[PDB]
Amino acid sequence: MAANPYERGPDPTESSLEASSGPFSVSETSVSRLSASGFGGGTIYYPTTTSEGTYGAVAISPGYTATQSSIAWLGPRLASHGFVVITIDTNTTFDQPDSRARQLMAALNYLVNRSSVRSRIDSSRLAVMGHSMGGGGTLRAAEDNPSLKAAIPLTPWHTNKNWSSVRVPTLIIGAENDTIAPVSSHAKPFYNSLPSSTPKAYLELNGASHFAPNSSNTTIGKYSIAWLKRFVDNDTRYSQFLCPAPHDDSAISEYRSTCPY
Ligand code: NA
């Protein structure tokens, strides 16, 4: 048995992370706007099987004026690698980033305490993600809830540029050609303000617009899965994708260098 009790699924490959679906079959259920205390309802995607143990959970927020349909593809994509995922609607489509941060935490609270799949969730291993103003909300949730295990803002938008108190592992995904939350005034200032003692990464999508996160995207899927695995599951089998090195090769037992050059 693997030393890490949170490892789920077979050893990962680039192929298996780029594919449309991971190793786990996915089921879905929903929570109505009325039943959802403190948020606008959502769809819950979960692995049908329970025989490998409980899973971490992830809440995902859409952006300004948007609904679940703009982030829906992330549900099956991420859940099929071993996570319980809720794609939320917000109380109103005009909610600002700090309101979305509270709604992300309210959705996690619902999943852990009241949802029909709460028994397959490890309530100590939670994460937040979001698009645009939902990505701004992701940063605020990570700042205010340091017990979160991972945060992934997608083309984030926020008027606060200083995230120097974030102590949650954070992967920021920016879109090179974003004209709505330009990376020069949003994503990059956010990344630069995060502490260097916090595990972090910035991934910029070549040629991409603000709406790249709203449809199936091999790169967003690959690195979001690797980030959630590495930090929600402590799964160091995924370090090879986040921090590649020649010694990932089976023929190479060690590799040192004075890279970059
Ligand atoms: Na509600």
CATH classification of the domain holding 130: 3.40.50.1820
CA 222, 127, 131, 86 torsion: positive or negative?
positive
Distance separating alpha carbons of residues 47 and 25, to the nearest angstrom: 6
Domain-embedded: residue 112: yes
Give yes or no: 123 in active site.
Answer: no
Number of domains the chain contains: 1
Ligand 1 centre to CA of 91 (Å) is: 6
Q: How many CB atoms lie within 10 A of CB 56?
A: 25
Q: How many residues are given for the chain?
A: 261
Among candidate residues 80, 99, 132, 224, the one labeled active-site is 132
Domain-embedded: residue 55: yes
First to last CA, the chain: 40
Give the DSSP H or E segment for 164.
Answer: none
Count CA atoms within 13 Å of residue 205 on its CB side.
24
Helix and strand totals (H; E) in the chain: 7, 8
Give yes or no: 178 in active site.
Answer: yes
Ligand 1 centre to CA of 169 (Å) is: 29
Distance separating alpha carbons of residues 96 and 101, to the nearest angstrom: 9
Domain-embedded: residue 7: no
Read off the tokens for 102: 């509270």
**Beta-carbon contacts of residue 227 (< 8 Å; ≥ 6 apart):** 150, 152, 169, 171, 201, 238, 242
Ion ligand 1 residue ranges (Cβ < 5 Å): 33, 36
Distances (CA, A) of 219 to 17, 42, 213, 258: 9, 25, 10, 28
Read off the tokens for 100: 């979305």
Residue-number span of the structural domain to which 208 is assigned: 19-248
The residue ranges of DSSP E strands in 40-117, in sequence order, are 42-47, 55-61, 83-88
Ligand 1 centre to CA of 116 (Å) is: 17
Domain-embedded: residue 8: no
Ligand 1 centre to CA of 75 (Å) is: 20
Ligand 1 centre to CA of 36 (Å) is: 4
223-237: b or e for each residue (b if 16 or more CB lie within 10 Å)?
Answer: bbbbbbbbbbbebeb
CA 79, 84, 85, 89 torsion: positive or negative?
positive
Read off the tokens for 15: 């192929």
Ligand 1 centre to CA of 181 (Å) is: 28
Q: Are 255 and 240 in contact (CB under 8 A)?
A: no
Classify residue 45 as exposed, middle or buried by CB count within 10 Å of its CB (0-12, 13-18, 19+): buried
Q: Are 211 and 179 in contact (CB under 8 A)?
A: no
C-alpha dihedral over 126, 123, 165, 158, to 10 degrees? 40
Classify residue 72 as exposed, middle or buried by CB count within 10 Å of its CB (0-12, 13-18, 19+): middle
Ligand 1 centre to CA of 149 (Å) is: 25
Q: Are 25 and 47 in contact (CB under 8 A)?
A: yes
Among candidate residues 81, 131, 186, 210, the one labeled active-site is 210
What is the experimental method? X-ray
Ligand 1 centre to CA of 176 (Å) is: 35
The residue ranges of DSSP E strands in the chain, in sequence order, are 26-31, 42-47, 55-61, 83-88, 121-131, 150-154, 170-175, 200-205
**Beta-carbon contacts of residue 23 (< 8 Å; ≥ 6 apart):** 9, 10, 16, 80, 81, 82
Phi then psi dihedrals of residue 57, to 5 deg = -125, 150
Give yes or no: 186 in active site.
Answer: no
| Pairing, β 170-175 against β 121-131 | unpaired
Distance separating alpha carbons of residues 150 and 121, to the nearest angstrom: 15
Among candidate residues 89, 95, 178, 233, the one labeled active-site is 178
Phi then psi dihedrals of residue 162, to 5 deg = -105, 110
